[PDB]
Design a protein around this ligand. Structure first.
Ligand SMILES: [Cl-]
Ligand SMILES: [Cl-]
Lengths: 303, 302
């Protein structure tokens, strides 16, 4: 079975780290930054890594029982998580945390909804601090705060992510700081490895989204390594990787010729020949196409 | 030539609302016109109605916060763009802009803005898709919010979350199409209604229970094709060798095949069944293409 890429414009791609469309391609030097996201992690021969799931609407969602209001802390609610598909959290799993769990620290803004008893429903805005000491999704312990007290204990509860809340303090959004999946008394394990460009003059090519902000000042930048459609496609195809690097061409369909070329590394990230922090803006109908198997030494024309 | 993506039910996305599929479901749909406009694609990849390929975009809106509606209390006038940023073209051969809700109800979600600069703000919001002001085809939609914290003339996005049941707004009717053009306009360029034609068969739906924000509702939202089937058919552009693709639902744990279904060329599935009930199957089961048949192929009941 031959390796293939799905044919997609940038505007048809889905961010694999937050359930919103990709806005632009982006490259960065990543000065002082360790790139180690756990969502959107898949090898090109079909192995999912980190907390990556294939569903494109599920990343950064939570589901669970509303166990209780945290004693003494009004309108702070303790969830007992399940997995997003309904199966119980199993902390013996070989994952950093539950599939789809946020891979960044910050004030995640969204809506907590309930259905029950019966068909009675209710929903209100909520905030989950993925940087807080007790944020421990690996063992199913997550809390959310809400300005509403209209939540019932022991009813099924879902958290739909919307964006990030900026208070202007230590809790501020850091898309490259992994949470402590087990809370403040446990260390992360089974992480997908960090990635970096190893070849001179190359930088990682990211797929960037500007996610919504709920207060304060932020551009909401969320950079993933692969659009969710590439994850889904490699998962489906599980094609044999004939070399360590798949050479991609970003094709202008109006001319048939290359706009630029990129190296898709087998472990699931792309590099380009570029320098600095800036978007990669192209004609809107451009798409990546698989060109050939090459090695890590292949020299790319700069873009 | 023709393939179906290998997906469990829990890995499928509802094509009419951006949530995972909860179950397969079948119904007689007596006295109901089944004519959803999202999740509509032929098996050779032609998108119909308002169907787009992005799985996170259906029921989203974006555009300029034109004004607080004069007279009204905390009503905001959106001037839509298309979800890809391009301008709304009312002469397009669609009933409305791609991704537009295809049901009438009080759609609940969060309206967010960014601007001026990187200043941001977001608050709960709801859009009555049955209101006579709801006219997305010409880019006019209003939302209500308990908050007054919205800047005029800043980019605004509506992220859908669920449905809101209250007496003084339209109840959630998933099979009642909005008037995409506002009060007086007739809908046009609609994907057609679907129904089983062979005796003993019913449509097979992929059902989600979308969140409720208030009131009593089971949030039932039935689509004809999971969004991943839509994306796959769009990618493949494979020629339909007959009018029906015969599919088989199989459990990979045991190799047991559980039932067969008829995937009609124009983009929906039927099974031999009777009554309104979920189709509960082993968790790891999935559909697989078996053969090109016609509309008269007779299935064993499930
Ligand atoms: Cl597979
Ligand atoms: Cl195409």
């Amino acid at each position: 079975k031959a390796f293939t890429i799905p044919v997609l414009k940038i505007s048809e791609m889905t961010n694999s780290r937050f359930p919103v469309p990709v806005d632009q391609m982006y490259t960065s030097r990543s000065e002082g930054i360790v790139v180690q996201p756990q969502n959107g992690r898949a090898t090109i021969d079909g192995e999912l890594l980190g907390t990556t799931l294939v569903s494109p609407v599920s990343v950064c969602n939570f589901k669970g029982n509303l166990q209780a209001e945290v004693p003494g802390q009004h309108q702070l609610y303790q969830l007992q998580l399940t997995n997003l598909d309904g199966s119980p959290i199993d902390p013996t799993d070989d994952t950093p945390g539950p599939l789809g769990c946020p891979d960044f620290t910050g004030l995640l803004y969204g809506v907590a909804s309930q259905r029950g008893p019966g068909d009675a429903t209710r929903a209100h805005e909520a905030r989950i601090d993925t940087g807080s000491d007790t944020f421990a999704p690996k063992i199913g312990q997550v809390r959310f705060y809400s300005t509403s007290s209209d939540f019932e204990t022991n009813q099924p509860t879902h958290f739909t992510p919307i964006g990030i809340y900026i208070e202007g303090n230590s809790s501020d959004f850091n898309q490259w700081q992994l949470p402590r999946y087990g809370g403040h008394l446990a260390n992360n394990n089974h992480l997908a490895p960090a990635v970096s460009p190893l070849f001179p003059g190359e930088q990682i090519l990211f797929f960037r989204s500007f996610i919504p902000g709920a207060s304060g000042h932020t551009n909401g930048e969320m950079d993933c390594l692969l659009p969710q459609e590439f994850v889904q496609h490699f998962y489906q195809e599980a094609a044999t990787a004939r070399s360590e690097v798949a050479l991609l061409r970003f094709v202008n369909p109006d001319t048939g010729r290359a706009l630029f070329e990129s190296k898709l590394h087998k472990q699931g990230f792309m590099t380009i020949a570029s320098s600095g922090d800036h978007p990669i803006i192209m004609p809107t109908n451009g798409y990546f196409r698989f060109e050939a198997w090459v090695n890590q030494f292949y020299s790319l024309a700069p873009v």
